[PDB]
C-alpha cells in the first residue's frame, strides 16, 4: 500500500500565525489520467474526519481561502495562514490515486502562549 | 445532502462477534462502491473492506488483516451497507465509519458519524 507520513504529528503555533503541514508518499501520486488525488482531512474532537482540500490545492466547500494546499508528485504541504480557533483539530493527508486509498498519522494543530 | 450513519459499535471480547449497520442517503446507493474505513488507536486510518455496485457483481474486497474474519455486504434495496466481524482482535478495536466513492467526487468524500468498537 501507498504509506503517507507527515510531520509533525503536534503543530503549536500562535493565533494569527502561520503553520505549514509536510506530508509525503511513498510513490507518486499522479494518477494515470495525470491528476493528483492527495487530499486534506480535518477532524475534530469526536467527530468524524471532513474533506477540507482535495486534489492537492482545491477547497471543499465551505473551507476558507486561508488553506492553501501544494506541491506534487510524493511531497506536498498544507499551509493554514493567518491561524484562528475555527482550525484547531487534526488535519490528515490521504491519497486516493492507488487502492486501496491510504492516510498519514495526523497533525493536531494547536494554539500555543 | 449526502448522510451515512453507523450504529452497533460496542464493548466485545476477543475471538467474539459484532456486525455494524450504515443507513444512507442523499446520492445513488446502487451505482456506489461503499466501503468501511477504521480509526485504529494503533493504526491510525485505515481502510478495512469495500463491495462493489451490482453491474460489477457486487464483488467484495478486504484488507489482508481481516480477511476470512470480517464480511462486508449490501442492500440495495434498503440503501444499506453492513459489515459483519468475527474472531475479533484486540487489534480490531477503533472507531468505524462507513464511506463510499461518490459521483462528484469519486473518492471518500462523505463519512457517517462513526461507531466505535473496543475488543476487551
Known amino acids: 500500500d501507498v504509506v503517507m507520513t507527515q510531520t509533525p504529528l503536534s503543530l503549536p503555533v500562535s493565533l494569527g500565525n502561520q503553520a505549514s503541514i509536510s506530508c509525503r508518499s511513498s510513490?507518486?501520486?499522479?494518477?494515470?489520467?495525470?491528476?493528483?488525488?492527495l487530499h486534506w482531512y480535518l477532524q475534530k474532537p469526536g467527530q468524524s474526519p471532513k474533506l477540507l482540500i482535495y486534489?492537492?490545492?482545491n477547497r471543499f466547500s465551505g473551507v476558507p481561502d486561508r488553506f492553501s494546499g501544494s506541491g506534487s508528485g510524493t511531497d506536498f504541504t498544507l499551509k493554514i495562514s493567518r491561524v484562528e480557533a475555527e482550525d484547531l483539530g487534526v488535519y490528515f493527508c490521504?491519497?486516493?490515486?492507488?487502492?486501496?486509498?491510504?492516510f498519514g498519522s495526523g497533525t493536531k494543530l494547536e494554539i500555543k502562549r | 445532502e449526502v448522510k451515512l450513519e453507523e450504529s452497533g459499535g460496542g464493548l466485545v471480547q476477543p475471538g467474539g462477534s459484532m456486525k455494524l449497520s450504515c443507513a444512507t442517503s442523499?446520492?445513488?446507493?446502487?451505482?456506489?462502491?461503499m466501503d468501511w474505513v477504521r480509526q485504529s488507536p494503533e493504526k491510525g486510518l485505515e481502510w478495512v473492506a469495500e463491495?462493489?455496485?451490482?453491474?460489477?457483481?457486487?464483488?467484495?474486497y478486504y484488507a489482508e488483516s481481516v480477511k476470512g474474519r470480517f464480511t462486508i455486504s449490501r442492500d440495495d434495496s434498503k440503501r444499506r451497507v453492513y459489515l459483519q466481524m468475527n474472531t475479533l482482535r484486540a487489534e480490531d478495536t477503533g472507531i468505524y465509519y462507513c464511506?463510499?466513492?461518490?459521483?462528484?467526487?469519486?473518492?471518500?468524500?462523505?463519512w457517517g458519524q462513526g461507531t466505535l468498537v473496543t475488543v476487551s
Open positions: 464511506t463510499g466513492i461518490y459521483y462528484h467526487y469519486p473518492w471518500f468524500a462523505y
Open positions: 442523499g446520492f445513488t446507493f446502487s451505482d456506489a462502491w
Open positions: 463491495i462493489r455496485n451490482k453491474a460489477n457483481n457486487h464483488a467484495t
Open positions: 510513490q507518486s501520486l499522479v494518477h494515470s489520467n495525470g491528476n493528483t488525488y
Open positions: 486534489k492537492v490545492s
Open positions: 490521504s491519497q486516493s490515486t492507488h487502492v486501496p486509498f491510504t
